[PDB]
Amino acid sequence: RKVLISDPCCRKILQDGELQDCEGLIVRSVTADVIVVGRAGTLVMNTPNGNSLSAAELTCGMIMCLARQIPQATASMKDGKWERKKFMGTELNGKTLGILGLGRIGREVATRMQSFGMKTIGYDPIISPEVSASFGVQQLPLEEIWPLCDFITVHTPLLPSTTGLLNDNTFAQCKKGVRVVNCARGGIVDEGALLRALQSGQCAGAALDVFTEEPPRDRALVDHENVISCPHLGASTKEAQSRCGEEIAVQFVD
Amino acid sequence: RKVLISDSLDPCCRKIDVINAAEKLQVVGRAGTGVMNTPNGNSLSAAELTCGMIMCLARQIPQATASMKDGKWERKKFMGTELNGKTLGILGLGRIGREVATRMQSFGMKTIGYDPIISPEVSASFGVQQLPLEEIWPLCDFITVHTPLLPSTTGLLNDNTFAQCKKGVRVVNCARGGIVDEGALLRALQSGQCAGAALDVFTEEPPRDRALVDHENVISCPHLGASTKEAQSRCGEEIAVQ
Ligand SMILES: NC(=O)c1ccc[n+]([C@@H]2O[C@H](COP(=O)([O-])OP(=O)(O)OC[C@H]3O[C@@H](n4cnc5c(N)ncnc54)[C@H](O)[C@@H]3O)[C@@H](O)[C@H]2O)c1
Numbered sequence A: 001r002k003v004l005i006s007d008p009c010c011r012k013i014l015q016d017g018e019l020q021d022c023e024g025l026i027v028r029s030v031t032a033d034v035i036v037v038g039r040a041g042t043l044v045m046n047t048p049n050g051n052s053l054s055a056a057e058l059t060c061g062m063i064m065c066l067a068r069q070i071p072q073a074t075a076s077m078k079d080g081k082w083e084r085k086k087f088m089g090t091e092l093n094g095k096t097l098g099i100l101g102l103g104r105i106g107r108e109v110a111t112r113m114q115s116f117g118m119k120t121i122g123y124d125p126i127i128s129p130e131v132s133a134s135f136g137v138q139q140l141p142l143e144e145i146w147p148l149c150d151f152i153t154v155h156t157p158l159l160p161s162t163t164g165l166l167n168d169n170t171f172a173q174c175k176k177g178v179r180v181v182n183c184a185r186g187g188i189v190d191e192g193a194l195l196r197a198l199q200s201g202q203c204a205g206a207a208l209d210v211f212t213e214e215p216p217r218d219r220a221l222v223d224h225e226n227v228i229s230c231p232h233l234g235a236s237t238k239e240a241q242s243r244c245g246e247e248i249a250v251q252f253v254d
Numbered sequence B: 001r002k003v004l005i006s007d008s009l010d011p012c013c014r015k016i017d018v019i020n021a022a023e024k025l026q027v028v029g030r031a032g033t034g035v036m037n038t039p040n041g042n043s044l045s046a047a048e049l050t051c052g053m054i055m056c057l058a059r060q061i062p063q064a065t066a067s068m069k070d071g072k073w074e075r076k077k078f079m080g081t082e083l084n085g086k087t088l089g090i091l092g093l094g095r096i097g098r099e100v101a102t103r104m105q106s107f108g109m110k111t112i113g114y115d116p117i118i119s120p121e122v123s124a125s126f127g128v129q130q131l132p133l134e135e136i137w138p139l140c141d142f143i144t145v146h147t148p149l150l151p152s153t154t155g156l157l158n159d160n161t162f163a164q165c166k167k168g169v170r171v172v173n174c175a176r177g178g179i180v181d182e183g184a185l186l187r188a189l190q191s192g193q194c195a196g197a198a199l200d201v202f203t204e205e206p207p208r209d210r211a212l213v214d215h216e217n218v219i220s221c222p223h224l225g226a227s228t229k230e231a232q233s234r235c236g237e238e239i240a241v242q
């Protein structure tokens, strides 16, 4: 009947069809005291499909950034330095990417980096191999995945079974100087574990959009030279927020 | 005649005025594209960087990491673009230009371009739509130069180029310093005609002038296009064979 958009595509679709006199509420980025509700992002309702490509484009970005150290080369140049040897990087062609959770973003990531000649292996408890083989991902168990990977990237939801999906046990099986990406949720990579991997050279780089705490209190990872980061930007494009603004409003009419 | 390796090269090579001063000199051996060269020695590595630069421009990754590293969390400031459905202009359609094209095509990008000695039908084969340079400029969200440094290619992007570009055209140069007119690119960056630029290369290396490296909407590297373990290895052999 009456809905507030706490936080222009949404207002229009909803009208076409201070929360004291409100039936519904909409947001993007709701405490127990505050309590149909809708989130523009990934009876409560959200827009699962809206941020899929935009989160998937960031990941490919993180991957190439980790391969050629672009954000650490930029900061070097901006400090007036010309540091050639330091930033000797890695070629993606013929490397093996490991992808955890092959939902909406996993396959978008996988196909894209296939274009760069990356061999894409993967693992997912629900998505079948018949489905993964259709977008060039050979599914194997996690124990056959670790020692093959030059890069590993995570596109699973945050559950107990994924909370610490990459820990010390997993790093111990990976190739020396594995590179790692988390553009999904804070906690799927154990932050405790990723520092130790970084500190011993076991992990060669890391690209984080997400932290168990946001903003992260402990700065051990952010400040580490071989760690590049963003302030949870996976879903920060004009394209994505347009599509999430609609997907939510279309449902509210339904 | 013996051989001398001045610059920093990959071991495999060894195992397997200046010109004027040397009477014994018959052959200068270059490890790269830039007399013998390694034409397809470091094309991929270069293409892979170019593609990274486009990515970093689209989502302000270098800047965002600096922001985090300065103990800042500012979501609003780092609003980025989605490459899917955007148009990438590829000036020069050789080894690198086509490898860039097929990689970015995979992000659902429209690839238009220009190369004089490459026909529209050949570029068609690797997915790039050749049109006259005038028609190119206004269609582009993203421009990348992959030409040799030539008189004609010196300031190939100039004030006349940006005149015909979209408000907020983001530009990449992992080819040579000068191909993009540095003076032009700064004026464009200042008027916000060019939303941002990404540079591997400079007219002076290192550059004396800091206007472009310092600009907030510019990203940089100290000529890291050929700077992968794999690329230097291939080139090293690829010239030691020649
Ligand atoms: N970085 C951002 O700003 C941003 C924005 C949007 C999405 N995300 C996150 O990205 C993740 C994936 O999004 P999506 O749309 O691709 O999800 P999806 O729901 O489409 O797919 C999730 C997949 O993960 C798989 N999975 C679950 N547990 C697993 C495990 N233990 N091992 C392997 N696979 C497992 C599921 O079977 C499923 O295939 C989510 O965590 C989502 O919140 C982050």
Ligand SMILES: NC(=O)c1ccc[n+]([C@@H]2O[C@H](COP(=O)([O-])OP(=O)(O)OC[C@H]3O[C@@H](n4cnc5c(N)ncnc54)[C@H](O)[C@@H]3O)[C@@H](O)[C@H]2O)c1
Pocket: B032, B033, B034, B039, B042, B043, B046, B091, B092, B093, B094, B095, B096, B097, B114, B115, B116, B117, B118, B146, B147, B148, B149, B150, B152, B153, B156, B174, B175, B176, B200, B201, B223, B224, B225, B226, B227
């Ligand atoms: N950043 C780096 O470290 C790095 C590494 C490799 C190569 N490069 C440079 O990148 C450039 C491209 O190398 P390549 O491997 O593609 O060489 P290439 O010769 O295979 O391709 C360049 C193409 O540009 C075409 N061309 C000539 N004049 C043109 C014009 N006016 N407009 C458009 N196209 C024109 C040529 O005909 C040729 O087909 C070279 O200048 C090379 O030195 C840079």
